[PDB]
Design a protein around this ligand. Structure first.
Ligand SMILES: N=C(N)N1CCC(CNC(=O)[C@@H]2CCCN2C(=O)[C@H](N)Cc2ccccc2)CC1
Ligand SMILES: [Ca+2]
Length: 223
């Protein structure tokens, strides 16, 4: 997260870190045994780390649970990032409490101008690299489809939306991939892609979760 702020320990209790001997992506807990992340985060050997604030210190409240299943959307296209969504099943259920909590899925799509909370342990610099210890947060609005397509001509599908800023300085970044965009208490986005990070005229692009609610529920019910 570039241009954000320190969230505060466990203030984003649905945020998870995906770990493969290092933090590599975020995700969102949607029930005690399932996480939503980005398809471009898929790999074998995922350990889901819940309850984290400082990802480099055992502070208490952490739960580390291996993934038993990762399910990339069957229509994910890695060249366009269309359908950039993946479900991760936990080997055992997380213990839910005030610091480890699920986030509701949308009942309808969000509208342009809605302010959302984006979070993660990704890069905090728009030039160069710095990765934080503690979870970072950014308040960011959903942009109009027209502004999004103007920024990324030919690249925005119906399964994507833009959020953030056009003036530069505030965005998600590498290592935030797969993490949440929460608006009015609902998981509306997944950190997916962008040109650089926090660059002028190049907002963040996010998977449009409201298009996948039925697919999520059926995939969970069948697994
Ligand atoms: N500014 C941000 N809000 N983000 C936040 C998310 C991160 C991490 N996500 C990536 O790095 C994804 C994974 C694959 C390539 N890619 C890109 O974003 C490419 N730059 C553009 C692209 C290439 C091919 C297809 C679709 C898009 C990037 C910065
Ligand atoms: Ca920790």
């Amino acid at each position: 997260i570039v241009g954000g702020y320190t969230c505060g320990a466990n203030t984003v209790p649905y945020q998870v870190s995906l770990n493969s001997g290092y933090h590599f992506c975020g995700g969102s807990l949607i029930n005690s045994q399932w996480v939503v992340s980005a398809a471009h985060c898929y790999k074998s050997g995922i350990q889901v780390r819940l309850g984290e604030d400082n990802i480099n210190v055992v502070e208490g409240n952490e739960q580390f649970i291996s993934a038993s299943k990762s399910i990339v959307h069957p229509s994910y296209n890695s060249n366009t990032l269309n359908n950039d969504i993946m479900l991760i099943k936990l080997k055992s259920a997380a213990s839910l409490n005030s610091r480890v909590a699920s986030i509701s899925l949308p009942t309808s799509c969000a509208s342009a101008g809605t302010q959302c909370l984006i979070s993660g342990w990704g890069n905090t610099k728009s030039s160069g690299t710095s990765y934080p210890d503690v979870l970072k947060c950014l308040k960011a609005p959903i942009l109009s489809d027209s502004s999004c397509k103007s920024a990324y001509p030919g690249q925005i599908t119906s399964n994507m939306f833009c959020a953030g800023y056009l003036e530069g300085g505030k965005d998600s970044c590498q290592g935030d991939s797969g993490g949440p965009v929460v608006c009015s208490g609902k998981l509306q986005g997944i950190v997916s892609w962008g040109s650089g990070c926090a660059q002028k005229n190049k907002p963040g692009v996010y998977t449009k979760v409201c298009n996948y609610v039925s697919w999520i529920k059926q995939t969970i019910a069948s697994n």
